[PDB]
């Protein structure tokens, strides 16, 4: 059981919502595509495709509290082009539905892969642009005290008009480093040393992630530290080994990666900086 308070800024009548296909039961919760009717006073007879999150029926009291949390946090953080945004919620006379934006070309990684050489092909500008947009989004969240914790291509989603949007930021978390993702990869490959070892998570480690995220981008979908089992990665990093520069990657960019991977967290750049460098570099980068 439960009753929620309703904020009318955000309440959508649940009959204005046409639920459709699901897509995986994530880290608690389960999400389904849907069509919202209205959403906009201007054009109230238009459907808008949205993603709607709701509880599975095998759902604890906390599992709920969690959903309410991340909803309320998405409210606090506010809108930005380069993040997945809240658009509404259905709170009354039914189970809770937390509606957000549909990003119609999947995750960054899938979209990169689908655009390798012999569905279109990405120019050099198209890639740096992509890194730039993620940095913007990251900067925004950071400006709002948000620390991401699992930043990587899989957690960047892409809209029809090709805009990078960061996903799963307000995320309530709690520990197997062998836990495999859908694609078969290990979340530790994105983790900064101090996050790995001493559980210390900050903007600085979100920057380390962004390093690897750049690496993913300039390998059109790469898989980090290829065939280097978890155990080995412990040492390699400890000592100071770093990933290899990709082909089709300028020294400039490879040097960014390397600063995002500074051993001393405080000496890494910040997103503010990285946005400013990526803007310049995009302007100097040819189609
Ligand atoms: C819109 C058509 C469509 O097919 N969209 C689509 C398909 N896929 C498959 C990816 O392999 N992804 C999308 N876009 C999409 C997915 C999602 N979520 C799966 C999702 O969980 N969204 C979401 C996010 Cl990202 C979030 O971030 C904090 C918070 C949410 O709810 C609280 C939700 Cl639901 N979202 C948007 N677009």
Between CA 22 and CA 36 the distance in angstroms is: 15
How far is Cα 229 from Cα 245, in angstroms, rounded to an integer?
Answer: 20
CB atoms within 10 A of CB 280: 12
164 vs 156: CA distance, rounded Å: 6
User: What contacts 79, CB < 8 A, 6 or more positions away?
Assistant: 85
Indicate the DSSP class of residue 228. -
Give the three-class secondary structure for 281.
helix
Strands, E assignment, 40-145: 47-54, 86-90, 97-101
Instruction: Pick the catalytic residue from 66, 150, 206, 277.
Output: 150
Superfamily of domain 1-102: Phosphorylase Kinase; domain 1 (3.30.200.20)
Q: Residues with Cβ < 8 Å from 155, sequence gap 6 or more?
A: 107, 148, 166, 167, 168
Give the integer Cα–Cα distance in Å for 255 and 252: 5
**How many residues comprise the chain?**
287
Assign a CATH topology to domain 103-283. Transferase(Phosphotransferase); domain 1 (1.10.510)
Q: 121 CB under 6 A from ligand 1?
A: no
Q: Which two tokens stand for residue 249?
A: 């990657």
Q: Alpha-carbon distance 48 to 38, whole Å? A: 8
The conformation of residue 27, written as its DSSP 8-state character, comes to S
Q: Give the separation between CA 239 and CA 251, rounded to whole angstroms.
A: 23
Q: Is 86 within 8 Å of 93 (Cβ atoms)?
A: no
- List the domain boundaries for the chain: 1-102, 103-283
Structure determination method: X-ray
Q: To what resolution in angstroms was this structure determined?
A: 2.9
Kind and range of the H or E run holding 166: strand 164-166
* Token pair belonging to 2: 């439960």
Q: Is 23 in the pocket of ligand 1 (CB under 6 A)?
A: yes
The answer to whether the beta carbons of residues 89 and 71 sit under 8 Å apart is yes
Residue nearest to atom 31 of ligand 1 (CA): 53
């Amino acid at each position: 059981e439960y009753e929620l308070p309703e904020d009318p800024r955000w309440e959508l009548p649940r009959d204005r919502l046409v639920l459709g296909k699901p897509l995986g039961e994530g880290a608690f919760g389960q999400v389904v595509l849907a069509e919202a009717i209205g959403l906009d006073k201007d054009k109230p007879n238009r459907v808008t495709k949205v993603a709607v999150k709701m509880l599975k029926s095998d759902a604890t009291e906390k599992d709920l509290s969690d959903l309410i949390s991340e909803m309320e946090m998405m409210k606090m953080i506010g809108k930005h082009k380069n993040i997945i945004n809240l658009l509404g919620a259905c709170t009354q006379d039914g189970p809770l539905y937390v509606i957000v934006e549909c990003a119609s070309k999947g995750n960054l990684r899938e979209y990169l892969q689908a655009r390798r050489p012999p569905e279109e092909q990405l120019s050099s500008k198209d890639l740096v642009s992509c890194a730039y947009q993620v940095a913007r989004g990251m900067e925004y969240l950071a400006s709002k005290k948000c620390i991401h914790r699992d930043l990587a291509a899989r957690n960047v989603l892409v809209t029809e008009d090709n805009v990078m949007k960061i996903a799963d930021f307000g995320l309530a978390r709690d520990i197997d480093y062998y836990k495999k993702t859908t694609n078969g990869r290990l979340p530790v490959k994105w983790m900064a040393p101090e996050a790995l070892f001493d559980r210390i998570y900050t903007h600085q480690s979100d920057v380390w992630s962004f390093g690897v995220l750049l690496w993913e981008i300039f390998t059109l979908g790469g898989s980090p530290y290829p065939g280097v089992p978890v155990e080995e990665l412990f040492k390699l990093l400890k000592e100071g080994h770093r990933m290899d520069k990709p082909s089709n990657c300028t020294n400039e960019l490879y040097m960014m990666m390397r600063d995002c991977w500074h051993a001393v967290p405080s000496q890494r750049p910040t997103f503010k900086q990285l946005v400013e460098d990526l803007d310049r570099i995009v302007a100097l980068t040819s189609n």
